[PDB]
Design a protein around this ligand. Sequence first.
Ligand SMILES: NC(=O)C1=CN([C@@H]2O[C@H](COP(=O)(O)OP(=O)(O)OC[C@H]3O[C@@H](n4cnc5c(N)ncnc54)[C@H](O)[C@@H]3O)[C@@H](O)[C@H]2O)C=CC1
Ligand SMILES: NC(=O)C1=CN([C@@H]2O[C@H](COP(=O)(O)OP(=O)(O)OC[C@H]3O[C@@H](n4cnc5c(N)ncnc54)[C@H](O)[C@@H]3O)[C@@H](O)[C@H]2O)C=CC1
Ligand SMILES: O=CNC1CCCCC1
Ligand SMILES: O=CNC1CCCCC1
Ligand SMILES: [Zn+2]
Ligand SMILES: [Zn+2]
Ligand SMILES: [Zn+2]
Ligand SMILES: [Zn+2]
Lengths: 374, 374
Amino acid sequence: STAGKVIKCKAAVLWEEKKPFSIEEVEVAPPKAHEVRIKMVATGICRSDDHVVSGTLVTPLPVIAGHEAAGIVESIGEGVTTVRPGDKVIPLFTPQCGKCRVCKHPEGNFCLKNDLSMPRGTMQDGTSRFTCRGKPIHHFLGTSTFSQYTVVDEISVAKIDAASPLEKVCLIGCGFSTGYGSAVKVAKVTQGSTCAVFGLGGLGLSVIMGCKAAGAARIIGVDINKDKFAKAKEVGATECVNPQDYKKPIQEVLTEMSNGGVDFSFEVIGRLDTMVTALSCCQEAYGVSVIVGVPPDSQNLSMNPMLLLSGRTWKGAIFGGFKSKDSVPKLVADFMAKKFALDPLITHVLPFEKINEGFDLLRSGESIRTILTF
Amino acid sequence: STAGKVIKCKAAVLWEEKKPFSIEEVEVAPPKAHEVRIKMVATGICRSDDHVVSGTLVTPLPVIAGHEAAGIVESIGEGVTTVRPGDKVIPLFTPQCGKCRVCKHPEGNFCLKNDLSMPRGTMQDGTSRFTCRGKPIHHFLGTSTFSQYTVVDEISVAKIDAASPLEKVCLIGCGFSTGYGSAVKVAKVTQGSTCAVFGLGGLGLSVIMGCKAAGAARIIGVDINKDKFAKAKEVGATECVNPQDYKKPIQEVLTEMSNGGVDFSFEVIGRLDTMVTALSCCQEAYGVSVIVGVPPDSQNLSMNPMLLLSGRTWKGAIFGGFKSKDSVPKLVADFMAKKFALDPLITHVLPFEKINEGFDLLRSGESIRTILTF
Ligand SMILES: NC(=O)C1=CN([C@@H]2O[C@H](COP(=O)(O)OP(=O)(O)OC[C@H]3O[C@@H](n4cnc5c(N)ncnc54)[C@H](O)[C@@H]3O)[C@@H](O)[C@H]2O)C=CC1
Ligand SMILES: NC(=O)C1=CN([C@@H]2O[C@H](COP(=O)(O)OP(=O)(O)OC[C@H]3O[C@@H](n4cnc5c(N)ncnc54)[C@H](O)[C@@H]3O)[C@@H](O)[C@H]2O)C=CC1
Ligand SMILES: O=CNC1CCCCC1
Ligand SMILES: O=CNC1CCCCC1
Ligand SMILES: [Zn+2]
Ligand SMILES: [Zn+2]
Ligand SMILES: [Zn+2]
Ligand SMILES: [Zn+2]
């Protein structure tokens, strides 16, 4: 009863920074050519969504945020070939156009069609499909999953197993895949190695899962919230340290614990100081450090380049280095074949209408992932 | 007639920063256990030696500098098994102890016995073999090659082909191997790729040599001294750019020329600003940037970590990543088999007594490598 028509539905609109989401009626236009309209089933609350509220991540407002989700195709636009109505899908916050220089490179995944580097808050054609109170509303990362219905470009959606449990596999749309791939694909953690993981939220626990899958012998979790240590050890950490417990800088502590530096370190918080600390605690001649966390907008870090001249490697990645449309369906299939677990990341399940309580749980330190159900 | 005795010889002593070297008589003690005393034959002038004079590279003074050299063993201490009197040798400014975690690692080369990180200016045992005017003089990087005779630890010397031309292969002790390896071993430049090389001195020309050996399709040399361009093209650069010729920042020119960023970039100067520029000019999702230049002591750079989050890899290396004692004899063998050329790097030859003129040539921009003969 909705194909080709405007849909009126519920969404969580962010009208301005540092305010609660406003749960109210929006209008969702039908998909144009090469676009897909999706009925949302589940969406996770990721720290990157909170970064929009806090001003840490700048994107045009007002906006419908949300990017870690799964749903069912309601209708498709002219020329769509990769999904059909009724299909289960995961929106892709990093597109895979398949035709740019990055998509064609064996090691690149940050497709040049992304809306992250110079955010416009639109669809690929530069316009918006959302209206609220008569006003146009921006999209977020080409996904906008905090809504009962969204419209995405075809290059930003992947079809997944029809038997998938959507309230779990939405995490493959961001948190799991990003952390897991940061360990197994970006860092390329080796068997028998020592790893250090800064930040033990949903992303950091997924990094730990990847370090353990890669055969690391030691995995040191680092967090200022000791309530995060129990779950980190359940998913593979061999020990946890709270920097606030020590009188010396944690890079010195980790270098001593590791008899000279760790093999792999990961910054999974989003602080400039912990990015430099994580680089410093990896072994000076052969260590590798990977930045996953998102730093505050337009702020530079300061570091001594001798940390690199001795032999260290420093890198970062979006979405765990995974080519999004190729990888998301394979990752769902791996989950269905029991190759990794997602339940350890899920601490809370709430109806979508309680989105603000879900953010309060994240901000208070009490949750890993809250999954919102529509 | 000198074994077991103190040798009185000439050396170039640096008594204080920013002053000419003083060519005068020194006393060189005989080698203790596991040490080797070498009659020097030829030594190159590298910018790192000038960094000692300028205070850019801090090591205790007074000092006998020099680290790029080749000579003949005069005598060996007790227990030495890897060289004999009469052998041709190259001193190793990065040792290879064979026993530390770095030496045992498949990719590491910055041996933990190095005298770079926390410089003492001594032999491994914490003492010096040099006296001048009755005063003890420091060593430099365990090599101290600006002297007619030096004493090195066994882990800091490699035996080379007895037919080697010492006035050429001294460059394998530093400039050639560092630049060549930075391309072929550290960056792992790929066939058909586009490279940018910042700084076209002895080290940068050697990077170009490695990029060409690796099969790069384009190699863009970058230097503010346009007189360096002709030789850079002779050894493989396909084009050269002078940043002072442009109204836009050079990362912008290079991104434009490479249709979105280069595959590999190399900083081979030693400036904080060009380290950040070189990182920025490599492609944001899959580019690799290698720091080779030495930054000024204790200074930090400032950079936006979003340059890394998009997917860039940033690394540095000492000595082109080569394990020194294993690699130097193989590199000499390759030179003897005509696998690479050293003559393009040698622009001037002077007697050792004219060392100060050789440094004047480097500082004026006129030379690539001056080789000093003893
Ligand atoms: N590179 C990518 O593609 C993606 C990046 N991100 C970013 O990853 C980061 C982590 O996201 P989540 O796991 O969802 O966040 P989270 O808020 O659930 O976890 C962050 C953890 O960092 C801890 N922490 C905070 N300050 C700390 C400090 N000084 N020292 C040690 N620990 C500290 C917190 O206690 C918390 O447990 C965020 O910046 C997020 O924006 C998220 C997903 C995709
Ligand atoms: N990582 C390692 O193991 C080693 C590092 N080094 C360092 O490599 C660097 C290069 O050494 P050399 O080739 O012997 O020095 P060099 O002085 O012969 O060459 C440096 C080049 O950089 C150019 N240059 C200077 N400022 C520039 C600027 N703003 N922009 C563009 N070009 C600029 C100069 O005109 C010159 O041609 C030095 O810092 C040296 O200390 C040297 C050997 C071993
Ligand atoms: O969490 C999902 N995406 C993130 C990727 C890193 C930049 C901010 C958005
Ligand atoms: O040029 C030779 N060695 C250099 C290596 C980089 C640090 C300073 C000394
Ligand atoms: Zn693309
Ligand atoms: Zn996310
Ligand atoms: Zn040198
Ligand atoms: Zn060693």
